[PDB]
Design an enzyme around this catalytic site. Structure first.
Site, PDB file in Angstrom:
ATOM      1  N   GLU A  11     -55.025  87.744  44.691  1.00 30.00           N
ATOM      2  CA  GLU A  11     -55.917  88.834  44.453  1.00 30.00           C
ATOM      3  C   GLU A  11     -55.524  90.124  45.093  1.00 30.00           C
ATOM      4  O   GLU A  11     -55.992  91.170  44.680  1.00 30.00           O
ATOM      5  CB  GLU A  11     -57.291  88.493  45.034  1.00 30.00           C
ATOM      6  CG  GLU A  11     -57.988  87.336  44.296  1.00 30.00           C
ATOM      7  CD  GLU A  11     -58.390  87.668  42.877  1.00 30.00           C
ATOM      8  OE1 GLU A  11     -58.483  88.940  42.636  1.00 30.00           O
ATOM      9  OE2 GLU A  11     -58.595  86.841  42.032  1.00 30.00           O
ATOM     10  N   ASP A  20     -60.127  96.010  38.168  1.00 32.18           N
ATOM     11  CA  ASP A  20     -59.357  94.811  38.050  1.00 32.18           C
ATOM     12  C   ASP A  20     -58.592  94.846  36.737  1.00 32.18           C
ATOM     13  O   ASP A  20     -58.576  95.852  36.061  1.00 32.18           O
ATOM     14  CB  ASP A  20     -60.160  93.521  38.329  1.00 32.18           C
ATOM     15  CG  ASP A  20     -61.237  93.212  37.321  1.00 32.18           C
ATOM     16  OD1 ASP A  20     -61.216  94.000  36.307  1.00 32.18           O
ATOM     17  OD2 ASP A  20     -62.019  92.290  37.413  1.00 32.18           O
TER      18      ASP A  20
END
Ligand SMILES: [Cl-]
Ligand SMILES: [Cl-]
Length: 162
Positions: A11, A20
């Site tokens: 991540e 994202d």
């Protein structure tokens, strides 16, 4: 290698609001803030999560705190899910980590929906589950990450992350 380092790898760490891969407002280590298009709605969710007027920026410590909460929530969500708990109880320690990783990224409902793959995992048919897991939007959108997760299920080692 453990779940925290694994997810930290997948991540990354960002101290400022960002989007994202799907375009949603996120912060820290993969902590989704909102799916709304508004930066302001995002700033608001952030402040509420942190407990202070942040202005879209947090400290490392703050990020790690969200992270700890989210890993905890993921595991608990797995145990509370009728479809997930059984697979999870069936798996070895490494593979369990791979399940938590999918869950953390794609939500419990998301994962709970990979019916055929979950069944294959539970039956311990590694190679088949891998192929089946690959026929998904999840793999097509974030292939290198999916690939790491899948290898982990296939092999039962942390090789993809080493
Ligand atoms: Cl929160
Ligand atoms: Cl990727």
């Amino acid at each position: 290698m453990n779940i925290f380092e694994m997810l930290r790898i997948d991540e990354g760490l960002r101290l400022k609001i960002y989007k994202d891969t799907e375009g949603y407002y996120t912060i820290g280590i993969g902590h989704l803030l909102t799916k709304s298009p508004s930066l302001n709605a995002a700033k608001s969710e952030l402040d509420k999560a942190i407990g202070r007027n942040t202005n879209g920026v947090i400290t490392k410590d703050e990020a790690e705190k969200l992270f700890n909460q989210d890993v905890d929530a993921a595991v608990r969500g797995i145990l509370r899910n009728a479809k997930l708990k059984p697979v999870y109880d069936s798996l070895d320690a490494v593979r369990r980590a791979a399940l938590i990783n999918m869950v953390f990224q794609a939500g419990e409902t998301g994962v709970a929906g990979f019916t055929n793959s979950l069944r294959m995992l539970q039956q311990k048919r590694w190679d088949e589950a891998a192929v089946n897991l690959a026929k998904s939007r999840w793999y097509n959108q974030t292939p290198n990450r999916a690939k790491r997760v899948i290898t982990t299920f296939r092999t039962g080692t942390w090789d993809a992350y080493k």
